[PDB]
Amino acid sequence: WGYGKHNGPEHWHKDFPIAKGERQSPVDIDTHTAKYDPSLKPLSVSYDQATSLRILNNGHAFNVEFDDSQDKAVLKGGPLDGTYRLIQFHFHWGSLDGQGSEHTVDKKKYAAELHLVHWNTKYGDFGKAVQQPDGLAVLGIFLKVGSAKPGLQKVVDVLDSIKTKGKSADFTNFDPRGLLPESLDYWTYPGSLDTPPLLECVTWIVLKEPISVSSEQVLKFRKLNFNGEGEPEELMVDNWRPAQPLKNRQIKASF
Ligand SMILES: [Zn+2]
Structure with a gap:
């Protein structure tokens, strides 16, 4: 799997059948259809104590990893229930x-x-x-x-x-x-x-x-490589997935 013509997103369903499931992402946000939900609480981003460790090129993107052994960098509030720890970006x-x-x-x-x-x-x-x-x-x-x-x-x-x-x-x-x-x-x-x-x-x-x-x-960002060191160079560009069907789901807005 990758983002090329032969292993691209239109091909993923063969090895990962959930590709055509009922709650796939991303989606297109129709702002005229999105429902303003007054029962949405404000977001709570606590990142002052965050601890980054490293950055890595996994062949499809680069990740900035964080120490998630403790509640150092957390997200709560909004539509969420309980605490969510930052693992990576x-x-x-x-x-x-x-x-x-x-x-x-x-x-x-x-x-x-x-x-x-x-x-x-x-x-x-x-x-x-x-x-x-x-x-x-x-x-x-x-x-x-x-x-x-x-x-x-x-x-x-x-x-x-x-x-x-x-x-x-x-x-x-x-x-x-x-x-x-x-x-x-x-x-x-x-x-x-x-x-x-x-x-x-x-x-x-x-x-x-x-x-x-x-x-x-x-x-x-465009200078990265999909490929391993010593293989033909394939630039890491267009590593994004096409919008999927909302299928009944509803998009809520906090504003
Ligand atoms: Zn992503």
């Missing part, structure tokens, strides 16, 4: 500024999409969490091209070091609060993982407000 981008986000807003596509993954502490670990309908909570943030993102430069500067698949690099003292938009207004719906095994155990929380990144910021 990764992005999805395109070959051009015209595409890259997974979620779409009235069919509008952004340059990239940031996903913060959290698991419900009730289930003890991530592996058990992914077996429950309320197991994960993903915080999604849209990226648009404009001004540089002061807070994103640290990540940007380390990509040279993890250019190929399998590579990883120590990555401590990274503060995720630097990637957050000003407003925490959101849309939420029940969905799945965006990559196989595409388990249908996520509570998506898509922030209304995008963060802006500079052209040169995004450009460094």
Whole structure:
């Protein structure tokens, strides 16, 4: 599985049949259809005590891993029940500024999409969490091209070091609060993982407000490689999945 013509998202159903299930992600957010739910509590992002460990190139994206052995970086409130611990964050981008986000807003596509993954502490670990309908909570943030993102430069500067698949690099003292938009207004719906095994155990929380990144910021993302070191070079671009059928599900808004 990958994002090429032969192993791309239209092919995943053969090894991962849930690809055509009832609560697949991402989806298109119809803002005129989304229902304003007054019983939605504000989001609670506690990341002041976050501890990053490393960054790695897994062949489909790069991940910034966090120590989730304690309630250091948590998400609670909103539509969630209980505490969700930050395990890792990764992005999805395109070959051009015209595409890259997974979620779409009235069919509008952004340059990239940031996903913060959290698991419900009730289930003890991530592996058990992914077996429950309320197991994960993903915080999604849209990226648009404009001004540089002061807070994103640290990540940007380390990509040279993890250019190929399998590579990883120590990555401590990274503060995720630097990637957050000003407003925490959101849309939420029940969905799945965006990559196989595409388990249908996520509570998506898509922030209304995008963060802006500079052209040169995004450009460094485009220099990554899908391939392992010593194999033909295949640039890591368009590592995003096409929007899926809502199928009855309803999208709620906190505004
Ligand atoms: Zn993702």
